[PDB]
């Protein structure tokens, strides 16, 4: 059974890009004081940037190697990576591996809790055979009890447990799993449940409204990892192959940047209901959130996140003491754990390296690198005669 907010999500599924962008544009606005500040900071972070991906083969080794950056203010979220589960036995192997990881992480956490201590990150596609194409009934029957069991194990140790986000046609299933989990009696009062949402989806703002509703109804604070989205190519491909009325995601990168900012504001507005975790390696996005979060930061207000191997050089400037030239804002490192061989997944994941490749391009000016998304959309509208038009090289599926 659904709440009104929950039922509201469907409509936005693949709504016209011009409409979606129009609704959101001004919501992504940086106040003038904020915008100038964010630009200056963004500039100095990217400029400083213009001047290894596996944390450990086992969780014990990952934990051993974590002190170095934890001492500097970083936090960690560990994920036992590997291929999607194909059989129930694969799923169970992953289950066993997650359980063992939680005992180890919990022990190392040693009562640090869900904010300051490390946490676990899980992938639903690891926990159910052929999840990408699995049926609702079977997921609820077989996946849910695993998710609940892992979550209770994390509560026992008081560590955060985060649910990943995958392809857009998995969204609704994942939300049902989240809703049921939030009403478990044994989880009452505990706020360590975490969930990923993807800004590149047109449904994202509506998903946020539902999450706010859910946190309210279930009397908790949700830990929400806001990312841009990792599956853009395949989202575009699948909609074309299926001949849909439109895309579930934006087709221009700047639109996703606009969406991320508008969504970040919505998250920050409700400190009682949400602990926002801003996962980005983009220097402007970081700087903007930093200013948007306002004055009088406190540790439990929010955190940044990044991928191991991609984010440290940026966040070395952010996490740490102000006396040392840092910003004193925590960053949680997402740390893949497993045999280095199984790192092939990393290589498997252009779209997702937009900013990091652009900052590597020393022929690209820093000022265009850290340009305001909203301002850029207005410029595009000026040139093209209308706001929020789809990428010119990507027509609708039925074209
Ligand atoms: N897991 C997860 C967990 C953590 C801790 C992090 C930090 C990230 C992920 N995650 C990956 C994430 O979704 C992004 O792919 C990644 O963080 C890179 O984004 P960012 O650092 O913000 O750099 P950017 O500014 O260059 O953005 C790139 C981003 O823009 C979108 N894009 C690209 N091209 C586009 C076009 N033409 N039109 C619209 N949008 C376009 C893409 O989203 C691209 O990624 C991750 N991702 C998940 O989906 N789910 C997860 O659980 C995690």
UniProtKB/Swiss-Prot annotation:
Residues 52-363 are annotated as: Proline dehydrogenase. Induction: By proline, autorepression and catabolite repression, and is potentially nitrogen controlled. In the N-terminal section; belongs to the proline dehydrogenase family. In the C-terminal section; belongs to the aldehyde dehydrogenase family. Oxidizes proline to glutamate for use as a carbon and nitrogen source and also function as a transcriptional repressor of the put operon. Homodimer. This is Bifunctional protein PutA. The chain holds residues 87 to 610 of 1320 of the full protein.
